[PDB]
Amino acid sequence: MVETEPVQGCRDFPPEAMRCRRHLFDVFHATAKTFGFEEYDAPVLESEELYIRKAGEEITEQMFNFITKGGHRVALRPEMTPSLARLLLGKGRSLLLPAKWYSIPQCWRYERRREHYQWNMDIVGVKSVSAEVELVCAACWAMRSLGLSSKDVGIKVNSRKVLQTVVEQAGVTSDKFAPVCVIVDKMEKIPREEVEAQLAVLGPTVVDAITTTLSLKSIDEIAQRVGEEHEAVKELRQFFEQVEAYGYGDWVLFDASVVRGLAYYTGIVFEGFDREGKFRALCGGGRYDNLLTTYGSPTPIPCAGFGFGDCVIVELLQEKRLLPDIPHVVDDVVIPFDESMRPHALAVLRRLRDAGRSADIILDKKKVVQAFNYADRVGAVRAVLVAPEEWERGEVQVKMLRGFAVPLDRLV
Amino acid sequence: MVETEPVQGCRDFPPEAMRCRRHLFDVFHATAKTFGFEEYDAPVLESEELYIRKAGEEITEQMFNFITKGGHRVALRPEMTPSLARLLLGKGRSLLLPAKWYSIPQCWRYERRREHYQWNMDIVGVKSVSAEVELVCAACWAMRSLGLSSKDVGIKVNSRKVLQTVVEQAGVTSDKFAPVCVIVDKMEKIPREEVEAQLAVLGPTVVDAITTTLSLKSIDEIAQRVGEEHEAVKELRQFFEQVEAYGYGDWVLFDASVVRGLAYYTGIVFEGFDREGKFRALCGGGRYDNLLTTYGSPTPIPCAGFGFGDCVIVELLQEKRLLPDIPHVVDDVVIPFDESMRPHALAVLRRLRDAGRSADIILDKKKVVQAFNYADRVGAVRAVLVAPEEWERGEVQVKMLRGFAVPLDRLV
Ligand SMILES: Nc1ccc2oc(=O)ccc2c1
Ligand SMILES: Nc1ccc2oc(=O)ccc2c1
Ligand SMILES: N[C@@H](Cc1c[nH]c[nH+]1)C(=O)O
Ligand SMILES: N[C@@H](Cc1c[nH]c[nH+]1)C(=O)O
Incomplete structure (x- = not known):
């Protein structure tokens, strides 16, 4: 070692x-x-x-x-x-x-x-x-x-x-x-x-x-x-x-x-x-x-x-x-409902960052609950869930961490 | 050497x-x-x-x-x-x-x-x-x-x-x-x-x-x-x-x-x-x-x-x-009319910086015209002349570089 x-x-x-x-x-x-x-x-x-x-x-x-x-x-x-x-x-x-x-x-x-x-x-x-x-x-x-x-x-x-x-x-x-x-x-x-x-x-x-x-x-x-x-x-x-x-x-x-x-x-x-x-x-x-x-x-x-x-x-x-500990923060964590939604979630991630926001996307394959946990751990202000039903309507689900459907354009 | x-x-x-x-x-x-x-x-x-x-x-x-x-x-x-x-x-x-x-x-x-x-x-x-x-x-x-x-x-x-x-x-x-x-x-x-x-x-x-x-x-x-x-x-x-x-x-x-x-x-x-x-x-x-x-x-x-x-x-x-040259900039250069005004100019400098502005004060003894030249050289947005007549009225002279009397409070 x-x-x-x-x-x-x-x-x-x-x-x-x-x-x-x-x-x-x-x-x-x-x-x-x-x-x-x-x-x-x-x-x-x-x-x-x-x-x-x-x-x-x-x-x-x-x-x-x-x-x-x-x-x-x-x-x-x-x-x-x-x-x-x-x-x-x-x-x-x-x-x-x-x-x-x-x-x-x-x-x-x-x-x-x-x-x-x-x-x-x-x-x-x-x-x-x-x-x-x-x-x-x-x-x-x-x-x-x-x-x-x-x-x-x-x-x-x-x-x-x-x-x-x-x-x-x-x-x-x-x-x-x-x-x-x-x-x-x-x-x-x-x-x-x-x-x-x-x-x-x-x-x-x-x-x-x-x-x-x-x-x-x-x-x-x-x-x-x-x-x-x-x-x-x-x-x-x-x-x-x-x-x-x-x-x-x-x-x-x-x-x-x-x-x-x-x-x-x-x-x-x-x-x-x-x-x-x-x-x-x-x-x-x-x-x-x-x-x-x-x-x-x-x-x-x-x-x-x-x-x-x-x-x-x-x-x-x-x-x-x-000198209190100041935990890490990020504006958005984008969460693909599953792997089939990853391409759409990436488009969403692009939009958020284009607007000047700091944003992660869940990179591993993981369940929605664990993705929300990761979002909390990294100090996300907002979780953006990208799911098929909402995507069909030109929407994503947004949940303030400190889940309502929102039109893509209204995210930023 | x-x-x-x-x-x-x-x-x-x-x-x-x-x-x-x-x-x-x-x-x-x-x-x-x-x-x-x-x-x-x-x-x-x-x-x-x-x-x-x-x-x-x-x-x-x-x-x-x-x-x-x-x-x-x-x-x-x-x-x-x-x-x-x-x-x-x-x-x-x-x-x-x-x-x-x-x-x-x-x-x-x-x-x-x-x-x-x-x-x-x-x-x-x-x-x-x-x-x-x-x-x-x-x-x-x-x-x-x-x-x-x-x-x-x-x-x-x-x-x-x-x-x-x-x-x-x-x-x-x-x-x-x-x-x-x-x-x-x-x-x-x-x-x-x-x-x-x-x-x-x-x-x-x-x-x-x-x-x-x-x-x-x-x-x-x-x-x-x-x-x-x-x-x-x-x-x-x-x-x-x-x-x-x-x-x-x-x-x-x-x-x-x-x-x-x-x-x-x-x-x-x-x-x-x-x-x-x-x-x-x-x-x-x-x-x-x-x-x-x-x-x-x-x-x-x-x-x-x-x-x-x-x-x-x-x-x-x-x-x-x-990669064009990006010259240095500062918001304000405070100019004492003469050395008798330095204490007052320092009070003014304090106020400007208190408001979040970037500000210099003329540190050497120099004539007003040369102070304005220095202000231009350092890329000042504004020259703040602190002179006796204006000071008596609770004012300074402000001149936008890119000279009107202004109440102290209105500077910021
Ligand atoms: N020259 C100089 C002086 C003091 C220093 O104190 C330190 O704690 C570490 C490096 C160091 C270097
Ligand atoms: N390891 C490494 C590799 C490439 C480098 O190129 C440089 O121009 C200067 C330092 C340097 C160091
Ligand atoms: N250390 C690599 C770059 C690198 C960072 N992480 C992985 N690779 C290099 O110097 O080229
Ligand atoms: N070099 C000095 C500090 C200093 C900067 N300029 C003048 N003095 C020191 O290390 O203590």
């Missing part, structure tokens, strides 16, 4: 599970359309070189990579943002800006689940915090569309520029900044000792300064540290003013501990969370204004975006009882 | 290309719903063991396989049917039958394009030709939905049982039958000499018999060879009677040369083709009643299905001028 289980860390989606996944994806697609984003895609297989960032990132450390027969170093993508930038870099000046692009790629890791789907939303060519505002609103909109409220979830927001100043002023060379963010991202996960030790290895005074600024609880307190008109203060203020104007003020808040784990974030960063403190981050993103420059863009291209995985959100929705 | 091109043999789908792909997939999804099929999915990564059929198949020969870090032999799936059977075998008696399942997996090869998407449609648990009838009608329906007619395309249909008889009667051991089909499938591609030589290696008289039955041009001629009531003759006759009753008689025909290249087909086989003779097969499928038994099913499970790739169909549609 063949192995029935899927490959290690990978999920099967039989129809029941697929309906749940489709319920989620339908929201991702619907939200992107509502917000005027355009779909794109790229190959799950990318060059390994695309992800070599040398910053100690979990995402690049846990890369599902291999070598081809032809000796090329490839990887099943651990994230989408590098593929997006590749695409953008390829287009150059032909790309009209601003651009708002989205996708729902399967992304991979190797270390535990080894694959997940991740809704990606990115705004390209927008310098101002208006981009981050729209992105955060889009994530909130998706969560609201799924049945959650601002009592269930929120989005924590910060700017890496605050920390950038502290690292720069303390005297640390800026090439260590991305490594620092990556390490400080571990704070909530591991003891402050371990995190303190990691920064020591990187290269005590400056470490204290980092720690203090992470734990500042309000924006006023940040403004006391760096000034009321520091770059980050005005941007965060504008960000909250705009989100409030859109009507999502209750969904967002400031949190100085939020840095995210990716090397490339330069500005505002954010992450979604459940207000019971039970789950990992629901989504995460930020501004990354230098990535395209590091890829070789002759001109700086401002960018911002987020990823929103398919797994944590599902656990939250299940906890909140927002 | 990073490599902008995708990995060898793999496609990027920036928004323009993605719209075309989505036009196709929308038809695949819509046809499956019309026909009452249920979506499923499984991992692109499967165990290599799943595909080791030892029959000289092109599909298993050109397998994109590799070994994991942990030494497990895996493959990016070359086709979906084995994953489907794995899923079915896993469910056992819990699976209610008949079942009609579909998916649109990316499938992979290594040798030239190395990936394609392939719409898969399969009916499980149906013994009679009614399954093949529905499947062939579904493929025709998809092609019609894309703008093609029976003048553009058709589906050629045959049964492997005819050949099975000839191979069995000639005295050849039945374990060579699948290898024979695989070889005879090459007939149209390579010279009859090469094909004749391949069968010789497998193990002259029986070879002639095979050749003769492949070139019989009608079903009556098959009935002369094997009898009017041979198993295959009654099934083919019933198949054409049913397709004709559904109203697709003009789309289908008999062709004794059609065997397909897969080892597992046992009965009716079929393939779509363009009637100008310019392209490779548009789709292909058949009945495979023994596969689940070879996977270890305690009870035989009848199955039939097809695959329908995303590449050949697109070339055909382009030749027929049925």
Whole structure:
């Protein structure tokens, strides 16, 4: 017997599970359309070189990579943002800006689940915090569309520029900044000792300064540290003013501990969370204004975006009882009275489908009662019995499942 | 500079290309719903063991396989049917039958394009030709939905049982039958000499018999060879009677040369083709009643299905001028008169999206004329200018792009 289980860390989606996944994806697609984003895609297989960032990132450390027969170093993508930038870099000046692009790629890791789907939303060519505002609103909109409220979830927001100043002023060379963010991202996960030790290895005074600024609880307190008109203060203020104007003020808040784990974030960063403190981050993103420059863009291209995985959100929705099983449905099941009626039933099936209805025909030889049972099992709205006596009169028998003779023309 | 091109043999789908792909997939999804099929999915990564059929198949020969870090032999799936059977075998008696399942997996090869998407449609648990009838009608329906007619395309249909008889009667051991089909499938591609030589290696008289039955041009001629009531003759006759009753008689025909290249087909086989003779097969499928038994099913499970790739169909549609560029559209573009109006414009943006409309807001600081230009470029139906004078009156200016003051409430 063949192995029935899927490959290690990978999920099967039989129809029941697929309906749940489709319920989620339908929201991702619907939200992107509502917000005027355009779909794109790229190959799950990318060059390994695309992800070599040398910053100690979990995402690049846990890369599902291999070598081809032809000796090329490839990887099943651990994230989408590098593929997006590749695409953008390829287009150059032909790309009209601003651009708002989205996708729902399967992304991979190797270390535990080894694959997940991740809704990606990115705004390209927008310098101002208006981009981050729209992105955060889009994530909130998706969560609201799924049945959650601002009592269930929120989005924590910060700017890496605050920390950038502290690292720069303390005297640390800026090439260590991305490594620092990556390490400080571990704070909530591991003891402050371990995190303190990691920064020591990187290269005590400056470490204290980092720690203090992470734990500042309000924006006023940040403004006391760096000034009321520091770059980050005005941007965060504008960000909250705009989100409030859109009507999502209750969904967002400031949190100085939020840095995210990716090397490339330069500005505002954010992450979604459940207000019971039970789950990992629901989504995460930020501004990354230098990535395209590091890829070789002759001109700086401002960018911002987020990823929103398919797994944590599902656990939250299940906890909140927002993912009831939604059984399969079909409009019509056409039932031949017997096999002599099959040709006529097929003509009827054609008509129903011609009208835009979803319809089955009983394919096996079976008794009328069992055909009605099958009709119930598949969630048919209507059973259409095609029998000789009614057929003679230009009719079929129609029975609403949630048996009257009806002229063919009146079926639809 | 990073490599902008995708990995060898793999496609990027920036928004323009993605719209075309989505036009196709929308038809695949819509046809499956019309026909009452249920979506499923499984991992692109499967165990290599799943595909080791030892029959000289092109599909298993050109397998994109590799070994994991942990030494497990895996493959990016070359086709979906084995994953489907794995899923079915896993469910056992819990699976209610008949079942009609579909998916649109990316499938992979290594040798030239190395990936394609392939719409898969399969009916499980149906013994009679009614399954093949529905499947062939579904493929025709998809092609019609894309703008093609029976003048553009058709589906050629045959049964492997005819050949099975000839191979069995000639005295050849039945374990060579699948290898024979695989070889005879090459007939149209390579010279009859090469094909004749391949069968010789497998193990002259029986070879002639095979050749003769492949070139019989009608079903009556098959009935002369094997009898009017041979198993295959009654099934083919019933198949054409049913397709004709559904109203697709003009789309289908008999062709004794059609065997397909897969080892597992046992009965009716079929393939779509363009009637100008310019392209490779548009789709292909058949009945495979023994596969689940070879996977270890305690009870035989009848199955039939097809695959329908995303590449050949697109070339055909382009030749027929049925894939015009469909530019991006959005309902509204909201334009702040200036930055002082941004908060109010955001409130307006919220209202529009609340009503189910697709809407952008101008994110950058820009002049009203350039904002109107951007609105045209993104294919906006309407520009909503949010200006101080109108705002004072509880109004905005609305301009149909394919400028009158309008009360907020009347926008939607
Ligand atoms: N890169 C990345 C990150 C997180 C992930 O979480 C999963 O559960 C499966 C895959 C995955 C891939
Ligand atoms: N197994 C399989 C068969 C045919 C294919 O044709 C392509 O163009 C790309 C991938 C592919 C994979
Ligand atoms: N690639 C990021 C999310 C993201 C998209 N755009 C910007 N950031 C992640 O995987 O967490
Ligand atoms: N797996 C087959 C198509 C198919 C689906 N179901 C049965 N046959 C192919 O790739 O050609």
